[PDB]
Amino acid sequence: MSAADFEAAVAYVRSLPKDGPVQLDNAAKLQFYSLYKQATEGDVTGSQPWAVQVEARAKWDAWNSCKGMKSEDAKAAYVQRLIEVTSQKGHPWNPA
């Protein structure tokens, strides 16, 4: 995918209204969070947090799951995941 396709995917996620036809579940939120961090900040920072800290632990595990990818590898995955999660919910989003 093109770079502007990723920047538009990030904008579409950030422009999603509260009440709308597209609502991201928590699993999809973790997926987009992991791919975004992998394509913008590189590999995961820090060690595996306390499991009691459920959110921080969940975010670190998702980010560590993508460890070893280049930024361009994760940007296409971010676009593809957005195209898929928009199709199964009745409103397909596609770039360009």
- Which residues contact ligand COA by CB under 6 A? 10, 13-14, 26, 29-30, 32-33, 36, 59
Shortest Cβ contact with ligand COA: which residue? 36
- How far apart are CB 81 and ligand COA at their closest, in Å? 10
Tokens for 43, please give them.
Answer: 């590999």
- How far apart are CB 68 and ligand COA at their closest, in Å? 19
**How many Å apart are CA 20 and CA 12, to the nearest integer?**
12
**How many Å apart are CA 79 and CA 94, to the nearest integer?**
8
Give yes or no for a contact between 56 and 64, defined as CB atoms under 8 angstroms apart: no
Q: Which residues are annotated as a binding site for CoA?
A: 14, 33, 36-37, 55, 59, 78
